Amino acid sequence: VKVVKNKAYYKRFQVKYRRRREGKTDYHARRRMVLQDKTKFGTPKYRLVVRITNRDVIAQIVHAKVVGDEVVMAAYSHELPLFGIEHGLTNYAAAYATGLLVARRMLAKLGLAEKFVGVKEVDGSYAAVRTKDDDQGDDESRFPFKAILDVGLARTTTGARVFGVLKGAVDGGLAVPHRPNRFPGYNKESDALNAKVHRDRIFGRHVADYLKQVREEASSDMEGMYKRAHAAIRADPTKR
Amino acid sequence: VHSHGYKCGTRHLFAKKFRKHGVPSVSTILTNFKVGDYVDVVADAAVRAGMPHKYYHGRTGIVWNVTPRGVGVIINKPVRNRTVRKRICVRFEHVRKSRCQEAFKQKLKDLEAFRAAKKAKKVSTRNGGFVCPKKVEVLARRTADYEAMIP
Amino acid sequence: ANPMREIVVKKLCINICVGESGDRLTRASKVLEQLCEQTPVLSRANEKIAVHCTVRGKKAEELLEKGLKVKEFELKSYNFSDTGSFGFGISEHIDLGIKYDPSTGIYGMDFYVVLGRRGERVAHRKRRVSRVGFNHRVRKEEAMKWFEKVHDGIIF
Amino acid sequence: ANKYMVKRANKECFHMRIRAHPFHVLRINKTGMRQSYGKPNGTCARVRIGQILLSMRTKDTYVPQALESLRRAKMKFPGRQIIVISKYWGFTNILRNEYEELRDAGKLQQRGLHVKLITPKGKI
RNA sequence: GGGUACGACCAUACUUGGCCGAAUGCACCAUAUCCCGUCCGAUUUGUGAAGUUAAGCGGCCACAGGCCUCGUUAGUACGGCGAUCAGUGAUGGCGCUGGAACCCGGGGUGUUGUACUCU
RNA sequence: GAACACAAGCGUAAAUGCUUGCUUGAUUAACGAUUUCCAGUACGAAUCGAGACUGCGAAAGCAAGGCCAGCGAUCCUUUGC
RNA sequence: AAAGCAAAUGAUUAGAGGGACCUAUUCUCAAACUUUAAAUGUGCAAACAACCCAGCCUU
Ligand SMILES: [K+]
Ligand SMILES: [Mg+2]
Ligand SMILES: [Mg+2]
Ligand code: NA
């Protein structure tokens, strides 16, 4: 048969980008995420990079540069046991916790704490955060820190843990533009978000029900510690 | 006299390269332009939007206007017995920063550095000198090389 | 050797190529539904030529056992492939034991079974896709040996 | 060239190769000079200075016949041509005297009508 | 001395085959009550470790193909300017000068930024 | 080495191709600027913008037709505000 | 221009190793073929209506 991969094939071959070969970067989306108005002469633009592995949740704030991307702040799921969560570390509740940590640490670094404290009581309702592009009729007050969500190659479905990290960052004080169309409680028929269903997922009621069912299957608490964890992060986010 | 459209002699002019096809990279996206800069106008041929006319490929000019996704450049063009200053609007992908003044700027930086050091050189081959060979060969046009030029 | 190199059945694909559209396809689609207890899909050239379905799991193993019983637990040597998969076909669904109703009629089908190890996810996952590897790939001889160990019987 | 070789020698004592192919197409106009672009009429070969047109390889005892055969064939060509004896060995890029030693050493890979010297670089 | 995440240049980084791999990891892997999507939890989505370094990943090797670089081809091919130059012509050399390419031979087979991290 | 309505060239692989879901940026756009032909006139075509109302997206973002060929003065008639 | 077909597209001669077919070669080519690629060319810059530094003002 005709043999492909001869000498002529290798001479004419053009290799793709290194990170495209490794299957790590979508350069079609990355080009739009870094693009900025030329009338803004190089003013900083930040990204919120969220990557979830088989055993970890990673949240980073990244500023793109020609020499190489620069990471301003990073939070990981394995630092949660220092705050009070020693199980899960991958579930939706851990996604919320790490989003709060990265938002709290970044505001602490900038000195912008004790302002833009976010919400104190946790609820699943929509926020409609304030940005320069679309503000809520107010221009006198100081604007919050802004970043745009970067989910990478993950498939963006309703009630995914990537959008869990987004909610935690918004509740922590960051201004990441978004819509509630992808939150767990959102129903597309009525275009309404069940804040009750959302609130349970943040506090891990779905995990508790499955654990209780599993205990029953073997035969023949979580909400309280999550609340304590949220308080601990909001108190001393720089501990390590 | 037939068929003089916007892109007439552009088969090889707007061709990309050998083993260098694709779309502009991040380094191109992050370039900053400001009014008064010198730029080169080269087409990319992978971006159809905002591509200049074939005359302005390879030309160098100065920028007069910055827009959210575009740059305005002033370029000279001789018409009959005069040169007209033309203005073209192109996208930022078909524009590169020009290095036509780095030698001049480096000269200015050296001059101030020389004055700064003075406040706080070369060997001429043209002039003669002694030469000691220690060996001398001869060129004689041997008959062997005459026989060599026979394919 | 390694406790992760065992050969397992990945999927079982059943295809019925009636070559027609209409009531014949409707009966065939129902017949496949009762056989595998799972909704089938129609394949077209447009013309709606054939129907087929893919079965993976325990029900794939049970269906494979029933088809092998019809085929008398014997297969030819050239029925296999260098990829590591084989297949066959039966001519009568009544011989499979299914009760006969004098409305559907009698149909045949083609069975294909794909074997592999537990590392095949790497070539199929969306992020960081790669190639399996020469050692981990299942060869024809390994496939024939696997068929000799369980459901014995082969003729060259 | 073929006819003389058969008559004055054996048909199994020589091999002739024509090294010029007729790839160029000529035109004929065949109203006056209105719409004068012409139709194809024939074919020809474009040659240049120093180009080899014919090649004969044979044995040493038939070279007087080889020269005479080429002289008669040269009479059919326009322009000026010369007949020379190659320094190489029979359609090969190898010198006549060096070929015997290299063939003895065995470092000459053999192809039909041409010879490639063995290269040290490669899989053993 | 390594790992992970985000990168810049985009083969000295690719392709085939072979050998090896402490730790933190990465990964394969287990399973469908809930969110979510399929003919099929194969892909995707949610839960979590009972195992496994077999594969993925990293390092090394191959007179291996490719790729990069320096020489050789070669002052060769071709060229700008000059002649009341040669030649029937086709063409060519000379004077002042610019100057290649393939084949082939020697060498090489990624460099590195930000953050968190195991000796 | 396929496809992208049609002639050809250029271009493109988690796409500029194919399938699918939702849509009407093929609307309006204060006489903004410019390129090609060029007399630096018009017409045709095209590029970069400011304002309104929107579409698709979680977002960054993309879109005021289908890239470049596919079209028309004075006078008169007719429609809209 | 040259060079190349032992590199993509097109044309094309003959042998060799496993009648077609395959592998590696081989003779000869291209205004509407090309990896490579001159000479002669063609934009821009090489300061005073400007530049460098210091201290300020306004939006
Ligand atoms: K607008
Ligand atoms: Mg996307
Ligand atoms: Mg048009
Ligand atoms: Na070009």
Q: C-alpha angle A43/A48/A54, rounded to 5°?
A: 155
Q: How far apart are CA B77 and CA B58, in angstroms?
A: 13
Q: Which of residues 143-182 of A touch strand F (CB under 7 A)?
A: 148-149, 151, 153, 156, 163, 177-179, 181-182
DSSP helix/strand/coil, C40? coil
Cβ of D32 near strand G (distance < 7 A): no
Contact by Cβ (8 Å): B60, B100 = yes
Q: How far apart are CA C131 and CA C134, in angstroms?
A: 9
Ligand with minimal distance to B68 CA: 1
Q: Which nucleotide lies nearest residue A153, CA to C1'?
A: F14
Contact by Cβ (8 Å): C4, C117 = yes
Nearest to B47 by CA among B31, B20, B24: B24
Comparing alpha-carbon positions, the chain C residue that sits nearest to A154 is: C127
Cβ of A23 near strand F (distance < 7 A): yes
Q: How far apart are CA A64 and CA B16, in angstroms?
A: 28
In units of Å, what resolution does this entry have?
2.6
The sheet carrying A46-52 orders its strands as A70-76, A57-63, A46-52, A148-150
Q: Where are the beta strands (DSSP E) in D1-124?
A: 14-18, 24-28, 39-44, 54-58, 108-111, 114-117
Chain C contact present for A137, CB below 8 A: no
Element (H, E) at B70: strand B70-79
For residues A196, A197, A201, A205, the Cα torsion angle rounded to the nearest 10 degrees is: 80
| Method used experimentally | cryo-EM
User: For A38, which of B21, B26, B92 is closest by C-beta distance?
Assistant: B92
Distance measured from the CA of protein residue D17 to the C1' of nucleotide G14, in angstroms = 10
DSSP per-residue letters across A90-153: SSHHHHHHHHHHHHHHHHHHHT-TTSS---SS----------SSS-SS--SSPPPPB-EEE-TT
Q: Which of residues 90-129 of C touch strand E (CB under 7 A)?
A: 117-122, 124-128
Q: How far apart are CA B30 and CA A38, in angstroms?
A: 9
Any residues with CB less than 8 A from the CB of D99 and at least 6 apart, and which? D89, D92, D108
Q: How far apart are CA A203 and CA C128, in angstroms?
A: 32
| Two structure tokens written together for B39 | 């730029």
Contact by Cβ (8 Å): C77, C98 = no
Please indicate whether, in this complex, the C-beta atoms of B23 and A64 are within 8 angstroms of each other: no
Q: How would you label D51-89 residue by residue, b for 16+ Cβ within 10 Å and e otherwise?
A: eeebebbbeeebeebbeebbeebbeeeeeeeeeeeeeeb
DSSP helix/strand/coil, B48? coil
| Two structure tokens written together for D71 | 């002289």
Residue C95: alpha-carbon gap to chain centroid: 18
- Nearest residue for G46, CA–C1': B104
Mutate to test the interface with B, among A26, A38, A133 (most CBs of B within 10 A): A38
| Two structure tokens written together for B33 | 């332009």
Q: Is beta strand A148-150 parallel, antiparallel or unpaired with respect to A46-52?
A: parallel
Element (H, E) at C13: strand C8-16
**Which residues lie near ion ligand 4 (Cβ < 5 Å)?**
B 12
DSSP helix/strand/coil, C30? helix
Nearest to A97 by CA among A89, A107, A106, A108: A89
How distant, in Å, are the alpha carbons of B26, D13, D15, D98 from that of D61? 75, 10, 15, 21
Distance measured from the CA of protein residue C67 to the C1' of nucleotide E34, in angstroms = 38
Cβ of A14 near strand G (distance < 7 A): no
> Would you tell me how many other CB atoms lie within 10 Å of the CB of residue B90?
21
Chain B residues within an 8 Å CB radius of A34: 26, 29-30
Please indicate whether, in this complex, the C-beta atoms of B66 and A35 are within 8 angstroms of each other: no
Q: How far apart are the first and last CA of chain A?
A: 64
CB interface of C with A, residues 65-104, below 8 Å: none
Chain C residues within an 8 Å CB radius of A23: 127-130
Any residues with CB less than 8 A from the CB of A217 and at least 6 apart, and which? none
Q: How far apart are CA C11 and CA C84, in angstroms?
A: 13
Q: How far apart are CA D115 and CA B27, in angstroms?
A: 53
How distant, in Å, are the alpha carbons of A39, A40, B24, C108, C133 from that of A36? 9, 7, 15, 62, 43
Please indicate whether, in this complex, the C-beta atoms of B66 and A39 are within 8 angstroms of each other: yes
Contact by Cβ (8 Å): A222, A228 = no
Q: How far apart are CA A50 and CA A101, in angstroms?
A: 13
Secondary structure percentages of chain D, helix, strand, coil, to 5 = 25, 25, 50
Q: How would you label C65-87 residue by residue, b for 16+ Cβ within 10 Å and e otherwise?
A: eebbebbeeebeeeebeeebbbb
Residue A137: alpha-carbon gap to chain centroid: 27
How distant, in Å, are the alpha carbons of A44, A199, C148 from that of A122? 31, 7, 62
Contact by Cβ (8 Å): D19, D52 = yes
Cβ of A214 near strand E (distance < 7 A): no
| Two structure tokens written together for A142 | 């100081």
Q: How far apart are CA D41 and CA A6, in angstroms?
A: 42
The sheet carrying C41-43 orders its strands as C41-43, C50-55, C8-16, C109-116, C85-90
For residues A170, A174, A177, A182, the Cα torsion angle rounded to the nearest 10 degrees is: -20
Interchain touch C–D (≥3 Cβ pairs closer than 8 Å): no
Residue in this structure with the two tokens 């990478």, named with its chain if needed = A152
DSSP helix/strand/coil, B95? strand
Q: Which nucleotides of G are covered by protein (CB under 7 A)?
A: 6-8, 11-16, 21-30, 34-36, 43-47, 51-52
CB contacts < 8 Å between A and C, how many?
10
Chain A contact present for B32, CB below 8 A: yes
Amino acid making up residue C1: A
For residues A223, A228, A229, A235, the Cα torsion angle rounded to the nearest 10 degrees is: 150
